Design a protein around this ligand. Sequence first.
Ligand SMILES: *C/C=C(C)/C=C/C1=C(C)CCCC1(C)C
Length: 137
Amino acid sequence: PNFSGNWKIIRSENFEELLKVLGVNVMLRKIAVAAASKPAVEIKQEGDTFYIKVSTTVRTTEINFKVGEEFEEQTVDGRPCKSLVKWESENKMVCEQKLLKGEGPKTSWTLELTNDGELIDTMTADDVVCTKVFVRE
Ligand SMILES: *C/C=C(C)/C=C/C1=C(C)CCCC1(C)C
């Protein structure tokens, strides 16, 4: 499994709903949903070391991590967290997030590469799940 590539979105579900249940107000949701409904996703994978760049009309997020080693991130609604990615299976990784301060919904993201070569991303807050599917350019 090599997640490396530039990935282009073909399906999305529940993105605004995820922001809504996290408490994001409607004005900010509409900006977010417009800016981030065709996110460009680039991955460079070198074994267990990953670089991910997600680009929207208003934000560039670059993440660098090694599977099994804690790193710093912010949650999708902007709260500082410490993150840790593990392999769930050979083709799917899960990022658990812990808030640095205070309490809040349990948040995570996952990335899975299917046999057919699609990339499935999920982002969760408690029991609400956003799912996006991409193909390699
Ligand atoms: C609309 C979906 C996103 C903006 C997702 C971004 C994203 C990934 C696709 C995987 C790495 C984490 C994160 C930046 C949250």
